[PDB]
Symmetry: D3
Subunit: 322 residues, 6 copies
Amino acid sequence: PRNFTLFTGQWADLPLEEVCRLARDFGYDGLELACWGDHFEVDKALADPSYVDSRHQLLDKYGLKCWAISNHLVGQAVCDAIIDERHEAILPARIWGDGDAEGVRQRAAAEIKDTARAAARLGVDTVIGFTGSAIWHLVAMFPPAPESMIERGYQDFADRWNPILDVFDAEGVRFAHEVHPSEIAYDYWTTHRALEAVGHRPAFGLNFDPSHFVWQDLDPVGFLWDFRDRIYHVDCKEARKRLDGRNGRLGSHLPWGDPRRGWDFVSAGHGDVPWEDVFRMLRSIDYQGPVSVEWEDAGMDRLQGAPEALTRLKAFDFEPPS
Amino acid sequence: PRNFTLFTGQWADLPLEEVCRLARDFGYDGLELACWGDHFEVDKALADPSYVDSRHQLLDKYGLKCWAISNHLVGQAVCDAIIDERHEAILPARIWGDGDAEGVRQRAAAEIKDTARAAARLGVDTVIGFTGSAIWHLVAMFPPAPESMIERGYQDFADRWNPILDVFDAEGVRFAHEVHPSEIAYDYWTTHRALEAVGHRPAFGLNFDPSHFVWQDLDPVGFLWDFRDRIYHVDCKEARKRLDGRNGRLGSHLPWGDPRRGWDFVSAGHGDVPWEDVFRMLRSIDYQGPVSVEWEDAGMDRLQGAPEALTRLKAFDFEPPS
Amino acid sequence: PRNFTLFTGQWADLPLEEVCRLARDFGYDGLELACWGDHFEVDKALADPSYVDSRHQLLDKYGLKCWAISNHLVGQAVCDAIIDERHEAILPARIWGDGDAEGVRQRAAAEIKDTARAAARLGVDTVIGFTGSAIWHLVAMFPPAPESMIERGYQDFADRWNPILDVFDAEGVRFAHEVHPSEIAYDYWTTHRALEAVGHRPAFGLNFDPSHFVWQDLDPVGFLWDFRDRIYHVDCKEARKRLDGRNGRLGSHLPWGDPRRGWDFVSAGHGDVPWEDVFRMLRSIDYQGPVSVEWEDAGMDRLQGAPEALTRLKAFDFEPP
Amino acid sequence: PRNFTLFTGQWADLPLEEVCRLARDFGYDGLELACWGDHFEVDKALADPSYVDSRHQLLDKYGLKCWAISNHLVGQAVCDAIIDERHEAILPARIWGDGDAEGVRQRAAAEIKDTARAAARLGVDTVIGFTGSAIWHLVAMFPPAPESMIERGYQDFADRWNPILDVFDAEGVRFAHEVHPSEIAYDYWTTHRALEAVGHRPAFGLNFDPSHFVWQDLDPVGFLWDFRDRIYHVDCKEARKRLDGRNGRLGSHLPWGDPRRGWDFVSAGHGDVPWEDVFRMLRSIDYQGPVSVEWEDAGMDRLQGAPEALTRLKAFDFEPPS
Amino acid sequence: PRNFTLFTGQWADLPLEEVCRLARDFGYDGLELACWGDHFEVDKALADPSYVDSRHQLLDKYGLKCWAISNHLVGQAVCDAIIDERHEAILPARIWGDGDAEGVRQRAAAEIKDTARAAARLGVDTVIGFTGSAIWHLVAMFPPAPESMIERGYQDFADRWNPILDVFDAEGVRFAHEVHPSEIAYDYWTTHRALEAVGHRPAFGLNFDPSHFVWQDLDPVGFLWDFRDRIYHVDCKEARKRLDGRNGRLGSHLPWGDPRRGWDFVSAGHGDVPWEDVFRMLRSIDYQGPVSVEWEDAGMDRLQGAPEALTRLKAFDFEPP
Amino acid sequence: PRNFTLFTGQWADLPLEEVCRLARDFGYDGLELACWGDHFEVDKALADPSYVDSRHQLLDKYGLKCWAISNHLVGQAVCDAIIDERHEAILPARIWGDGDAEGVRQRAAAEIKDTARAAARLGVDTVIGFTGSAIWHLVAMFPPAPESMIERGYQDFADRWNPILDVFDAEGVRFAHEVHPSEIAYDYWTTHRALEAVGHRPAFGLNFDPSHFVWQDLDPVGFLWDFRDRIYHVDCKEARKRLDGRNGRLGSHLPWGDPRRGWDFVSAGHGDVPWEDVFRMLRSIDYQGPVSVEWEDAGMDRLQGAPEALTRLKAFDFEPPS
């Protein structure tokens, strides 16, 4: 009886129609559409008056709903200080353009304004994404950066995103920033500071994803409570620690699935997230949106895990007392 | 009856002579000389054939020995991919030069070479320092970097450091890299990979500092065991966690002393480092160098903390059995 | 398998026939009959010669048995020092009477005596209940109470219960006291002390419910072992802690289901009770009674939770070798 | 260093002068005066114009200061719903009167107003105390009380204490409620609710005593941060858990020092209170008052424990830095 | 999926045909055959040229395969310093003989050489077993044993086993020693020392059973990584601690199922083995053998537990990406 | 609880007089005399009527007392089923005889009887010892041993020790069996069972030593409580765990001091024994005997560790309340 959604980003190698068939076979109520692959093309949603109708027709055909779209990939390029080949690999060529860092940040900003406009054409009220950060690479604090440098990072985020959020407001759409490493908000305390930076304006809320709370030792339940009025979307993504004295909290620059990582992504129920408290708290905060599933586990096949993760997560979804 | 030594880096605002006076009053047996302030000037050591004697005479005046010198500040600039104002603030103007990233890296490598030469002049066999890292900023792994980018980070370390280490070998001096965040080896597993990158050559060993093993959940005692042949120096630096669910393992880009940080440096005995096991393991490993103390605690005055830390650490220094 | 029963107290808003019908559909083998609502009326059981048979006939129609009845509500008012509107709300008007504290305590005692009589008529050998406590409200120990005041509390328990227990003995019925906050025995050590107050007499045994062991940090398995000869009934009631630094062990006088509580009642399998060890220990102590379920979870619907709790609990119920 | 005072409550069997001799011997800087024994007699303070200077003269003689007086015993009787022999034993006979509950509560309120007036005469700006509670005995919630009964106990607190606190305001004194079992505020959440019942008026603040935080599992550091603006006084009282599966968190109505209790009061440093974190946070919040020591340990002699407790507590009292 | 196998040892009171029927009903893919009961008789396998084919026919009849046989009972007698009625109870009379310690030890060695030969005839590449130990009884270290006495025990292992393992090499069969108490290798460190004793020769590998890693506080996952090139077989046996301050890690010489043991054997999923990490690690080390189940739980019936244990374990068996 | 003694067993390489001088310089009040070395010779104490006065004179000379003598080495050979080179190393040649197992057991019994007689001559009322065990070697339970074999081991203990204990009773002396691996009572539950075996007769009590409780995860405090009527003596010996996933609870047959052991003996205050609770409980159960120190730490020199261990342990010795 909550609505459950599959995040489409891990499936962007597949045509949308195949993802629709799969998600239906898996039992999902809907899709959280990634703004990449052929899933939701923001440029086409704006150029072609038919395009948004093709999206509904396709989803409707499989009995699927959509309450949100996601543009992590472009949002990352808005504030990142170091714009390089990793960005080139995740951006459309039209956003990359000549590869000039400031050029890319401006083009990414323009594209996020277009994402809100496309969301509203689609008729959804929430865009999930990332912001990037001018300051993330300073996280270790050696060599020391002055406080004015850290503050300028938050001011930079405000200066680039305030104009983006103006368009969000004009379109009647919300941004759900996913608190996550690499971002201006990645912590409980950085989320405070990032919210302060944009005057707590209602356009800028949060995509809650509990996975990165695990290795940082953040209480996801207390985060849900303290930021209750800014919980705009939920993605269930599971993480498992294996800290044996050798493996470390940072993962050692090692690929997903390498067992020498102190932590890794695993299918729901196979990890450490306290789903019991998380679900009870979404009710306590009267979170009314979809519950999305971002499926990732390097030791599993997605065809087996994605439906199993839905089953495991639903054991925590209860009818309220009547 | 192990020799205890005070690391001079947190004291570089002071003339060496004043540091010698305090270290003597505090009970230390010697100084670990920072290659900054007026403590150990690597250029003067090489240009002025009288300079090395001035160091011995000053040290001897206060009953102090020296078995090691340290150049974390220049070492950092050898491999760092992002060279900026933070490096400008820690470098002599003659190393910074024009500020060009690669130029600074080249001048920094040259200076570390001169550091080995200066060490040989002083008669000490170990240089403590940092390496920097071309890939540290990629730690979070979003946006993704291909495995090849990571591999080139370790190869970059090898290509910059092999020639510096060749000079160490020629001078009869060892490098003690301090495993620490923002370095090519910051971890148990990245230590293994960095040693491999230089073929386990004996010139490249390790400065053991347990402070950053705390937030990363690394066992300092197993590290000591597995890398026992490359433990070239020891710096006792203490760290305390305070992980209440809001504070996080990353520290939130928050200044030392801020109580919202998930962990902080504190004076020895006031944190979480397992000194009992560490000291027992140094004996098991037959570590026969000095035990140095790097004093740091933003909640305390150094003039009170430095002598107390020495007393707290000596409670773990026991006579071996006959 | 073991026989599993549903406690009827949380369903006293419903006519017994609807509870029978639900318990059958949920897969329960029987009912633990609350002595309130229309479930089990002690006075009718003794006055109307046909009443007990009406209970049998209803339960039998639904494929259900009964091994135990419960009178927590009346038992509470036997020893409580502070008799007030809370007791009024849980008592029938005949027991409340004029509302005079001593008179209530005495009428409540008479009614527990009658509960044992009613149980014997029904053919069950256990009555679950509460005792109340003259000293519960002294639990915090500021302002200090002298030790003589504490001792008088246990002696008050013995003085009021010994005559009730004489009647249980006459009727050949056991009393299964629910070790629970607000009772003379709420703890491992207060259980020892209460048992001694009554000379370890076999009439006064224990209803084991692990839920309140959770927040008090009591080992339910050791309690099972050390009190093995006096474990007379079991109610599986689950509780979950959420102790985040702000939420506290006492629950801050907050209603059930408030997330600011340090612990709360949740449905079986969703909390902290060590069911694996509890169930293995029930076999080791040769507990041969029913396994009852008292269903509570302010975050859930009883229609969904009651049958799920049954299923979750049956995963810990093993065939003997 | 900070100033440390001895709380006089556990010494009220002794004449004040004797306590001054002992506190001076133990190394304390001052006394938190209990409003009982012959330590601080509130009625004499107001009746006898020379009484208050007799207090200063006596304290001055021993080089002791006073920053606070304490009336736990009387304050308890203001809101308590059950008034009985426990109150008779802690109250002056002039307040107990005939022992009729409402008369006791009325008399106790009038005496707490007098305590504020006597504070102002003595020249101290803080009174520590208790409030008692109309609803504490409801803590277990069987047999159930309606939610309106709970709300009424908080309103009873406000109605009885608002007129007391008006006198505090008029006299220029503040009240430091000790969060503690048996009081309207005994928990983190009940403190919030109690502060809100009196509209967060600055007359009503808090005496911080970490000992009852231990068995309740309350984070005392987070408490200090969240109520930083209402920490009016600090009392260090230590507590040790021994929760072996048999002993329980409630203490089983067992006397202090009985080993079957799940927790007990012990001398500072023999228990579980995180003093390292507590003292650091006191600086972080800029608590500038005295650090008082309430000495209690049924397994020890006070003559030994009191000076030792001071010594262990001073180990956490750091000079700044400068 | 992986192939799952039932170890036949706890089932040796039953004829092999009954065991096959049950394992098929339970859902197993195969049998790990115990070299006792009528399950796999090494002497008959060798003397009777058609015995092996009766093993195959019987297994094929129930759709079962066999990748491994086990001879823990005879293996134990090879190195054991104290040979007594515990050994007489687990040996064929022909191996026990006169009961002279050295006599049994030599006869046991000869019989393990024959087990390797019987395995080769059957067509399996792995024998699971035990070694015994000349120094096990010295584990507590009071009264003190000289370090030379301890080296001698490992040398005794190498001297008795090297010749056995030459037969394994001749026959194209591996020995999977089960790291387990009372064995020369029972720990992480003792395994290192025993592999060194035989110069890490590839004939001597390991049977991985995580059960005894639990009470000894050994990381089964790190053991798998560090000994990855020598994990020759896997037996899923589950273990549960209950260390309440009275119960101790040694089990107090108390029988299986006694609630006063610090740890006990329990059915898969009921105890403490980190199956999630174990299974992921089996894939990371490219373990390609069967996953066997040794079923043991004194609190439970095997007819209920063996199929359930299979179901619980398979929830950790996931397809590769 | 406050006379402290030094156990002399680890000092038996030295003349008694030299142990006395050291124990006195260390600050010990007395000695727990081992029945080996030249410290206390059981046969001479019975044969020579001046021998016992020589002991008193030597201890008086150094201001030392004695309340107890120990014969671990001989006691272990009464019940041990496997009598070999290990017993030969710890036994006097007159007890070892020809080494035939049953004769050794029989002679060790006769010698323990004489140890009671000699305790009485010295004027002490307690002998500390071991019993050995016919069943210790069966602890791992593979190959299986029938339950009747286990029962026989406890009957064997009763059969051999009952007659020993009758001699203790005749002399007015008690036996304090040290619960310890390799004994018939090594556990909480095997202690119950051994006590039952001898009908809870008062001659057979217990020497409490917490060190072996650590690795077995036994609560030393609950033990003291449940066996309170049989705590005849206390030896404070400390132990420390290091269980990193590779080291095991059993210690891998590795010598003391090897870092690959899962636990080891360390000097008091350097391990895991809960001294705070241990000392409080000795006082709760009214233990009035001495507190002996058995000093052992392969990582330390006994000349520094023995006085230090006493200083640490004394920090838990509190004056009772007045």
